[PDB]
UniProtKB/Swiss-Prot annotation, chain A:
Gene this protein is translated from: RPL10
Coiled coil recorded as keyword: no
Glycyl lysine isopeptide (Lys-Gly) (interchain with G-Cter in ubiquitin), cross-linked positions: K39, K100
Primary residence: cytoplasm
Cited function: Component of the ribosome, a large ribonucleoprotein complex responsible for the synthesis of proteins in the cell. The small ribosomal subunit (SSU) binds messenger RNAs (mRNAs) and translates the encoded message by selecting cognate aminoacyl-transfer RNA (tRNA) molecules. The large subunit (LSU) contains the ribosomal catalytic site termed the peptidyl transferase center (PTC), which catalyzes the formation of peptide bonds, thereby polymerizing the amino acids delivered by tRNAs into a polypeptide chain.
Protein name as catalogued: Large ribosomal subunit protein uL16
UniProtKB/Swiss-Prot annotation, chain B:
Gene3D superfamilies assigned to the protein according to its UniProt record, in alphabetical order: 6.10.140.1730
Segments for region (Disordered): 1-36
Name of the featured protein: Large ribosomal subunit protein eL29
Keyword Zinc-finger: no
Subcellular location: Cytoplasm
Organism of this sequence: Saccharomyces cerevisiae (strain ATCC 204508 / S288c)
InterPro entries in UniProt: Ribosomal_eL29
One BP annotation, GO: cytoplasmic translation
Keywords for the protein's UniProt record, in alphabetical order: Cytoplasm, Isopeptide bond, Ribonucleoprotein, Ribosomal protein, Ubl conjugation
Domain of life from the UniProt record: Eukaryota
Curated annotation (Swiss-Prot), chain D:
Gene name in the database record: HYP2
Effect of V42D: Temperature-sensitive growth phenotype
Record organism: Saccharomyces cerevisiae (strain ATCC 204508 / S288c) (Baker's yeast)
Name recorded for this polypeptide: Eukaryotic translation initiation factor 5A-1
Expression triggers: Expressed in aerobic conditions.
Lineage: Eukaryota, Fungi, Dikarya, Ascomycota, Saccharomycotina
Main location: cytoplasm
UniProtKB/Swiss-Prot annotation, chain E:
Effect recorded for P55Q: Confers resistance to cycloheximide, an inhibitor of polypeptide elongation
Organism for this UniProt entry: Saccharomyces cerevisiae (strain ATCC 204508 / S288c)
InterPro entries: Ribosomal_eL44 (IPR000552), Ribosomal_LSU_eL42 (IPR053708), Ribosomal_zn-bd (IPR011332)
Protein name per UniProt: Large ribosomal subunit protein eL42A
Record's keyword annotation contains Ribosomal protein: yes
Length: 218, 58, 159, 142, 103
RNA sequence: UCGAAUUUGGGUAUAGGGGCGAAAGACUAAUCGAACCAUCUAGUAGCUGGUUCCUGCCGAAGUUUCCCUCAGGAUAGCAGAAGCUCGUAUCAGUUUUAUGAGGUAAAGCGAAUGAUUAGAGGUUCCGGGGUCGAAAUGACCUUGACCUAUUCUCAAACUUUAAAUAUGUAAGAAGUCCUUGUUACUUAAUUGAACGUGGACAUUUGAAUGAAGAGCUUUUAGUGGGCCAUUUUUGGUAAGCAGAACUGGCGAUGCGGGAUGAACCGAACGUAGAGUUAAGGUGCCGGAAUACACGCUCAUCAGACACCACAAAAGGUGUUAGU
RNA sequence: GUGAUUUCUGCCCAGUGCUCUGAAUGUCAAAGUGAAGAAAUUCAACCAAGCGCGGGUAAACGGCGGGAGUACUC
RNA sequence: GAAGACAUUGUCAGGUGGGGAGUUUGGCUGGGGCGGCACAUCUGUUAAACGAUAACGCAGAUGUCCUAAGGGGGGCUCAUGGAGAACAGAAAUCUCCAGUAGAACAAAAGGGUAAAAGCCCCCUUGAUUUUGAUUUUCAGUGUGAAUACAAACCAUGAAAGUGUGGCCUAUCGAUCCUUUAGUCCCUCGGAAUUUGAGGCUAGAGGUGCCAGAAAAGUUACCACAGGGAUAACUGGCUUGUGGCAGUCAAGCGUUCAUAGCGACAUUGCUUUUUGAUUCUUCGAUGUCGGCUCUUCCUAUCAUACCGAAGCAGAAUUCGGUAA
RNA sequence: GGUUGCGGCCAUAUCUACCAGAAAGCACCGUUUCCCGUCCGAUCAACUGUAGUUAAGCUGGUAAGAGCCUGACCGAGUAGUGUAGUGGGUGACCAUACGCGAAACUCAGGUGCUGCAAUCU
RNA sequence: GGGCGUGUGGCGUAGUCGAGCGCGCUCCCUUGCAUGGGAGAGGUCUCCGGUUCGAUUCCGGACUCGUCCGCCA
RNA sequence: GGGCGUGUGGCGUAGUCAGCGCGCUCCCUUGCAUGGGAGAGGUCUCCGGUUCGAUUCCGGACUCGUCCGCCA
């Protein structure tokens, strides 16, 4: 009962989010976005691999769900359920419309054609760009060959072209590997639930000393 | 039998055929819309000025 | 149906601005306009009386009438294939003097000063403005400025 | 004005109409196409509020029918004498112009006033003629 | 709406030329006289054969009328008219609105 | 069907909104849901068809507003004709300089509004579930809220910020400066306002470029179905679909090229001669190198040129070059 | 109007018509009557039939519903 | 003989009167009809940062309400949160603190507003008179709405000032006719007085199809002028839907992803489905099905030769060259 | 230079937490007969400048302070965009040519200036 | 052809994952215009698989029944 | 497919930005006839918004009953 994704592949319309002018959309099919060992610390998983688009198109929420299930299932079967952290870095906010025509014989007796042809919501999609990350996984350096294969299996569920790039960053942060290493040898990083908070030279010295004590322990 | 609703095609060409002449400006523009208390005094001021110039160059 | 009211499509045009709402400062009431002054029109949304229409926002005109709290301004409006003369009564919160006119008057008085001082010698005053001429010959030296060779950089991911 | 126009399709059930210069209240509405090409016609069956007669009219749907203004007003009885009720308004105004009802409503109201209940009377105004339709008893404020 | 029964307003009655007290009423049209020229012409045109000779209006759309107040100066008896906007309910009896009291 | 509610001759009666009808709107002289003839009558038609010699010059519109207006008119616009007042300017689909105005593209969300993923630390006179508890505004875990510092992703009807392109004004003589006349306006007041008298400043007189004359008036035709292309863009799965914005076109237009074609590329046209080219081409059709140079490809459906006359995901120790 | 014979033609007069020798001021023309006026005229009373009120009529046009209990009953 | 000043007849007046006559029975519109109002308007957006800008585009709204919810002045600060106080608790009243508006301002939405434009109190009628000018829509017509003055007369405050309805953007109506107010002015044409009538200036009674006809159907008995500007065939563009084919592989298959299948996803093809559109045809292209007859396509049911199997034989299934 | 009265621009001026303030001026402060206003002389009104106090207001300083302001060749000539091609690509879209040119980020600095009149060790 | 829902003892019918009632008649007791009372029998919850610990109950498939929409000019 | 109406205690329903009557269950009184008073009983179909407050005002959803879906 669902149209093929080629009818909604391209970004032909303006963004159409769920708002107080829509008020009746179907809920998204993808619901879980962070999975694997999502409660892991930052220095547990140094390596990060990205599935990144090469197209300017719309990805369906159904396709996002299918790719998430495929990559998660493959990596938990080959490497264990808590050896990786996968994060879906796109969210379906664009709403797809359909002008539903009757498929009955002699439909033109009651069709009215293209008059008042404004559509009804039937699906949700995420609008991506050139070089935008869809999937991001962080793991140890011993799981590179299985997370590349997991992303390669997940790439079949997506239209268009995607690339698998091994990032130069440490995990889900934005510093490089030696930059993060020379930062964490000092005490100016401090862990959070999954992420890490950093020290800055601004701010009040009392707060900067109750937090982050080992760097000032010089 | 629907038809074309509205367009602005060819309109700037039609205007710029013999078009977009600026209005002619003049010395001594019109005093309509100017404040009547100003004009009522301005009449007497010009009348006195004309009488003084006539008496000077009589 | 369609809607073309007096203040249609004037949302961001007649918003005030960020962090300068409230009452207006007293310089706009202390400024003095005379007949023949050239003024810019920018409406103040805080004052609802004497408002200009949305067409005249950012338009520049000439004062022709001065009343108690307002100013009469003449604008030239393109209607069809010609310009028409439009007379507007605007409160003084919606107008300010045009700075280009006072810049030109400063050029006039400095220009007359130059002509007056150089008339005592006759030194070919050359009072017209000139645009940006092509730059002439020069000698650039390498003392402490030996050239540094640059090359194109190879490609990287940078994510 | 006393009365205002309306469209037949704009009319609906339990609404007031003017039929043959009488205030009437609709009980039935039915629309049937005149011809396959043509517009539907509205057949209206209504009951006069004052007299209880059944009046029907059919019209084009696009036609405009006259509609009265009906006001229902709430009063307390003071006396029933000579077939004329005496009523008492909020803020203490009194009217005696209302004639007493002549049917089983009037009989029940007469017996209720004879045996001494405090009776709340609803009288309606439409097109310059006045009548009483129903009565209740005040459950509180005895 | 509600309008008070009296009003101090301008009177151009050639002796006042100022604000005097005025008693207000509502304007009523008055009966259409016979022997008005249009009525005589209409009767002459309607006599004979030919049926109805003039249009009779049917497509009524307004539900209200503009109310007209008749002001009457108490000194020199001169009268003025002024119209108001459209209102479904109108009254001249002054029952003033009161603020901090119950429903 | 054939002895009768039979068939039929002649005479006679009924005449056109009338007749007659065992009823079909049947018949009433090949004419009937109102006969025929003549006149009114050359009835009216916003609708279809046609509209008669040559050459020269200029040359459109399918758009604004109103209409029982939507196949039509009026009105403005576009066009022609007649000119008139002057003689290089009170010009300009242009640039520069100076100065305004704007809320789109972009960006932002550890900034307001709204949406939204994940943990962390706290708050229980201040939650809910279990377990331990006599019970407890009891305890221990868990889960929900709220707060605090973070984190992932967004917005036609969100925004602090904010372009590009378009867009207003000014670049003087109708100007600037000095002095002092008028007034019933205005001021406490010759204070000011406006218009003035007299005097000074001229060809670099106030940026560039170009001007092909500049300005003004009257009158009237046709038109008021448009369509296509690039870019922006709306509805739609889409359409040689429907609807907008700026420009250029076709209509109204031939010529060279795209084999062919209204719109594409090039270029717009008096009659000829010579030369050079545009776009496109140079094996032969076919005018012009089976030129030169470096590589790649062998297809048991090769490929061969924009608009344009289609092909995708996924693969291949085919072959080549790379990381 | 229905359409030989045979056998039957149930219920409904609220609506729309049709029909009364009923009862009688509600609607209520012209003429006529009264008042006011200087008159044109204005205002009232009175006011025929028909409407309106009250009956009849379906071999007149027509019409012949729902909710519970256990065909029947409410 | 009967009847008799009653019938009859004549003229007026009321009723009845499709028996008959005449006429009417909107427009837009992805054909028309039904539906809706995109028909007079308003807010935000589409709208592409001056202005303008379409669709039966999106989200909504109007035919009202108000003697205060208008005008002037004075005092005060709101939503919310925290901490307290008998009954009194989630919500009654009182007190303090924080509080850029997160409240309120009649209504739809968007702007604007903090010693206020909000809440409370005091006084009032400027929601008044006289005609002009200007802005929006625009033909620079009307109507509606609005802006700034002039000449009066007022309100309020100590005053400067403010006020010509509602904080701003919507909230509404020609000619003819009737009626009211003013001037108590002009005319009734042989001359006067008084009624009556007609004029001048300003309002009201209303046309919502909102620049403004007085208006029910049917036609299968039908007619005329036209239209491919416009529907019902084929053909053409598109392929949602229909049909057919792939890729990936969580699983089914005792065990085993792929012998045979194959979820969640995703890429295509076809024009033997039905839609969508309106390009051609309305001075006509004969419109279902069957019978008859020829040829073509392959996405192969059988026959020929083969490969694979969860092929022992028999039977079967999957696939290839093949029309 | 401090302070007061009236201001202009309206955070470099605001906010949070501390510290300091000679002189003068502001301020808190004392009182209810009179004018006046309140449930309440708390606000407002009036009287005294006396009985007192810098505790607060106010001013200034401090803070790897929050905010705000300025600058950068910091990001970045990046994103976006005007013009051009019989450019690439099935397409989606993307390079190049002639031009214009952001925002976030990062870093550095700053934290009221001033007009008129009066008055002050 | 497609969609949607349905399936309980001989019959009707109640079911939140932990098969009851009424009717038929088996027996006994108890009565003209023939009753009542008490103990009875009676299901593979349509079937087949998986989940659970155990499915009427949850899920997937099949069967069956009942509705709704569909050929041409 | 589209449009309209519909749900209030068992029933009838009414309504201002949940009431009675008849049912039900008790009690009391007096026939010929009775009547009275108490209670238990209603998330106003449901869910939101608006509003001091919503049966009432609006939006969305469910159920049921209707009416159209025609020319070729
Ligand atoms: Zn007077």
């Amino acid at each position: 009962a669902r149209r093929p994704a080629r009818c909604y592949r391209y970004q032909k319309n303006k963004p159409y989010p769920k708002s107080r002018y829509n008020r009746a959309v179907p809920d998204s099919k993808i619901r879980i976005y962070d999975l694997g060992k999502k409660k892991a610390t930052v220095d547990e998983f140094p390596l990060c691999v990205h599935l990144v688009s090469n197209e300017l198109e719309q990805l369906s929420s159904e396709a996002l769900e299918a790719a998430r299930i495929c990559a998660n299932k493959y990596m938990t079967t080959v490497s264990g359920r808590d050896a990786f952290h996968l994060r879906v870095r796109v969210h379906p906010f664009h709403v797809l419309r359909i002008n539903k025509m009757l498929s009955c014989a002699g439909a033109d007796r009651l069709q009215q054609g293209m008059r008042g042809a404004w559509g009804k919501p039937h699906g949700l999609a995420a609008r991506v760009d050139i070089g935008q990350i869809i999937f991001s996984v962080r793991t140890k350096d011993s799981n590179k060959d299985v997370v590349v294969e997991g992303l390669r299996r997940a790439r079949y569920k997506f239209p268009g072209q995607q690339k698998i790039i091994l990032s130069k960053k440490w995990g889900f942060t934005n510093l490089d590997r030696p930059e993060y290493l020379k930062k964490r040898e000092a005490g100016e990083v401090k862990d959070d639930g999954a992420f890490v908070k950093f020290l800055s030279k601004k701010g009040s010295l009392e707060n900067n000393i109750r937090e982050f004590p080992e760097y000032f322990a010089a | 039998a629907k038809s074309k609703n509205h367009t602005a095609h060819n309109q700037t060409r039609k205007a710029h055929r013999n078009g977009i002449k600026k209005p002619k400006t003049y010395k001594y523009p019109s005093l309509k819309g100017v404040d009547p208390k100003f004009r009522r005094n301005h009449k007497h001021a010009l009348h006195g000025t004309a009488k003084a110039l006539a008496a000077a160059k009589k | 149906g369609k809607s073309h009211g007096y203040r249609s499509r004037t949302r961001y045009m007649f918003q005030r601005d960020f962090r300068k709402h409230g009452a207006v400062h007293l310089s706009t009431y202390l400024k003095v306009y005379k007949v023949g002054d050239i003024v810019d029109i920018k409406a103040n949304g805080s004052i609802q009386k004497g408002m200009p229409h949305k067409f005249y926002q950012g338009k520049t005109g000439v004062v022709y009438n001065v009343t108690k709290s307002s100013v009469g301004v003449i604008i030239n409006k393109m209607v069809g294939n010609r310009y028409l003369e439009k007379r507007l009564n605007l409160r003084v919160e919606h107008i300010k003097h045009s700075k280009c006119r006072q810049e030109f008057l400063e050029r006039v008085k400095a220009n007359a000063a130059k002509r007056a001082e150089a008339k005592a010698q006759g030194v070919a005053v050359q009072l017209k403005r000139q645009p940006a001429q092509p730059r002439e010959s020069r000698i650039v030296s390498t003392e402490g400025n030996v050239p540094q060779t640059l090359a194109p950089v190879p490609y990287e991911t940078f994510i | 004005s006393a009365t205002y126009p309306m469209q037949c399709s704009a009319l609906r059930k339990n609404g007031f109409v003017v039929i043959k210069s009488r205030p009437c209240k609709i009980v039935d509405m039915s629309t049937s196409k005149t011809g396959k090409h043509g517009h539907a016609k509205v057949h209206l069956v209504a009951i006069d509020i004052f007299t209880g007669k059944k009046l029907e009219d059919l019209s084009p749907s696009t036609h405009n029918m006259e509609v009265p203004v009906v006001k229902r007003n709430e009063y307390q009885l003071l006396d029933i004498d000579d077939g004329f009720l005496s009523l008492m308004n909020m803020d203490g105004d009194t009217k005696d112009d209302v004639k007493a009802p002549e049917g089983e409503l009037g009989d029940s109201l007469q017996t209720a006033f004879d045996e001494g209940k405090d009776l709340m009377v609803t009288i309606i105004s439409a097109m310059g003629e006045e009548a009483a339709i129903s009565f209740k008893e005040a459950a509180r404020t005895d | 709406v509600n309008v008070p029964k009296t009003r101090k307003t301008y009177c151009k009655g050639k002796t006042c030329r100022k604000h005097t007290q005025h008693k207000v009423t509502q304007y009523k049209a008055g009966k259409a006289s016979l022997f008005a020229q249009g009525k005589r012409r209409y009767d002459r045109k309607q006599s004979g054969f030919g049926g109805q000779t003039k249009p009779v209006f049917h497509k009524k759309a307004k539900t209200t009328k503009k109310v007209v107040l008749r002001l009457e100066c108490v000194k020199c008896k001169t009268r003025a008219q002024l119209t108001l906007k459209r209102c479904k309910h109108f009254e001249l009896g002054g029952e003033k609105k009161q603020k901090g009291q119950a429903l």
